[PDB]
């Protein structure tokens, strides 16, 4: 018998899966139609692709949570399969941060962006943002095993540091610090400066910028805080403690709440896009 958080996590997973799949497919098609003569499109192309790939793997978690830790895929899948989504999340976060940096570099220094800006620089930046997730993903590849239970039939797949406690502490600290503190600071600083400069001249003054900025930053912060704050605590803690069990119980709700951001991401692009219907019609 499933407990109360499980059914809520299940329904949130289903809703986010369906809506993210549809939105991501639509955005991917529309953007890939016009990735040749527009620099701005290739920034969102990678975001949409990564978000689609991350959202595609939800039914695996669905089947894993509907039953009691059912893992009918052996150790080969246990070693690799989580890494795909664990890479996609970080790729999406870094892509959002680099998009914010690009907007900052567009508002300030407007002449350097006219003579020395092209598609090659954007492609290189996207490649670097994509490749930066490999370093964070590698420990998951190198420290994942499968354990078999000779008590009534159960199969467990999970991470195991047998005698590398300091290694686990170091990797958890590095992932937390980088993947949360760096992008949040980048976005908040860049957007604050952009708003301050934009609201100083009559010609450039507008209202939509404030709404977009506050929506993006608030959504990111609120929808990604609980996941990391619970994950760091359960990584630090001893494997034998009641609070560890409570964190294990709340893990599914935390990860679903984190996933909701995948649904949140493309609605802003669709709603705040100029002539989206016409762009769809052309494609």
């Amino acid at each position: 018998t499933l407990r109360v958080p499980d059914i809520l996590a299940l329904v949130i997973f289903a809703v986010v899966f369906l809506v993210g799949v549809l939105g991501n497919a639509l955005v991917v098609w529309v953007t890939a139609f016009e990735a040749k003569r527009t620099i701005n499109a290739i920034w969102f192309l990678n975001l949409a692709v990564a978000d689609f790939l991350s959202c595609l793997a939800l039914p695996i978690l669905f089947t894993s949570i509907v039953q009691h830790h059912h893992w009918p895929f052996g150790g080969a899948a246990c070693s690799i399969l989580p890494s795909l989504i664990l890479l996609n999340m970080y790729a999406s976060i870094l892509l959002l941060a680099t998009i914010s940096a690009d907007r900052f570099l567009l508002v300030f220094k407007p002449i350097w962006c006219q003579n020395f800006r092209g598609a090659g620089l954007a492609w290189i930046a996207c490649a670097v943002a994509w490749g930066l997730a490999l370093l964070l993903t590698i420990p998951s590849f190198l420290y994942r095993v499968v354990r078999e239970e000779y008590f009534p039939p159960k199969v467990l797949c999970g991470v195991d540091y047998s005698h590398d406690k300091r290694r686990e502490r170091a990797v958890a600290i590095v992932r937390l610090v980088l993947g949360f503190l760096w992008p949040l600071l980048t976005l908040t600083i860049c957007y604050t400066f952009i708003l301050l400069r934009t609201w100083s001249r009559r010609a450039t003054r507008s209202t939509k910028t404030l709404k977009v900025v506050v929506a993006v930053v608030a959504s990111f912060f609120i929808f990604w805080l609980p996941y990391q704050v619970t994950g760091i605590m359960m990584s630090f803690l001893e494997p034998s403690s009641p609070t560890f069990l409570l964190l294990k119980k709340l893990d599914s709700l935390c990860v679903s709440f984190a996933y909701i951001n995948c649904c949140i991401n493309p609605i802003i692009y669709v709603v705040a896009g100029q002539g989206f219907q016409g762009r769809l019609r052309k494609s």
């Binding site: 830790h69 797949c157 294990k248």
Partner: peptide, 6 residues
């Protein structure tokens, strides 16, 4: 042995 994600 830590089960689930991570």
């Amino acid at each position: 042995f830590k089960p689930x994600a991570x």
